């Protein structure tokens, strides 16, 4: 159906935790979350589509990290990857859309991986939940 008006909140905090390969976000509305650096790079806002499409089917990474944050257009950030990818872009919508679905859309990779015969690089996490 018709698209939204991009009335998303605007990010007013960004923090890292290389300890556990994660990144933290705050908005100016009284919300925060944390996302996996693995998820960030697989679930790019485009990859090898056409500019603006869904991303490709990707494997885990090994021990990705962030090396800098640099804003763009006052409304998005570059999140330069020490794994060797200093060129990507993150609009505020995208990061919330990941965060609010960071479970179902993660389960996606573990499933499609095996149906796809792709790789499985070293990826540990420690924040697992088991409800519903």
Rounded CA gap, 85 and 66, in Å?
10
Helix, strand, coil % in the chain, rounded to nearest 5: 25, 25, 50
Name the DSSP class of 85.
B
Task: Look at the block and give the residue holding tokens 């800098």.
Answer: 68
The whole domain housing 116 covers: 1-132
Torsion, CA 15, CA 16, CA 17, CA 18, rounded to 10 = -170
The distance in angstroms from the start CA to the end CA of the chain is 29
Method: NMR
- The tally of domains found in the chain comes to 1
Quick check: 106 and 21 in contact, CB under 8 A? no
The residue written with tokens 């390969």 in the block is 21
The Cβ of residue 121 has, within 10 Å, a number of other Cβ atoms equal to 13
Total residue length of the chain: 132
Task: Tell me how far apart the alpha carbons of residues 97 and 92 are, in angstroms, rounded to a whole number.
Answer: 9
Q: Cα(72)–Cα(70) distance, rounded to whole angstroms?
A: 7
Residue 94's CB: how many other CB atoms inside 10 A?
A: 16
Both tokens of 34, joined, read: 């944390």
Residue 27, H or E segment: strand 22-27
R_g of the chain, CA atoms, integer Å: 15
3-state class (DSSP) for residue 22: strand
Rounded CA separation 116/112 (Å) = 6
d(C-alpha 89, C-alpha 97), whole Å: 15
């Amino acid at each position: 159906g018709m698209t939204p008006q991009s009335d998303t909140p605007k990010v007013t905090g960004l923090k890292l935790k290389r300890k556990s390969r994660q990144l933290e976000i705050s908005f100016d509305n009284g919300q925060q979350f944390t996302l996996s650096c693995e998820l960030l790079r697989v679930y790019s806002p485009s990859a090898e589509v056409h500019g603006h499409g869904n991303p490709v089917l990707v494997t885990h990474k090994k021990n990705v990290n962030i090396n800098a944050i640099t804003p763009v257009g006052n409304y998005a950030v570059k999140l330069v990857f020490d794994d060797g990818h200093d060129t990507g872009l993150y609009s505020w919508k995208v990061l919330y859309d990941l965060a609010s679905n960071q479970v179902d859309l993660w389960e996606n990779y573990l499933a499609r991986l095996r149906a796809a015969k792709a790789s499985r690089e070293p990826l540990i996490d420690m924040a697992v939940k088991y409800h519903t």
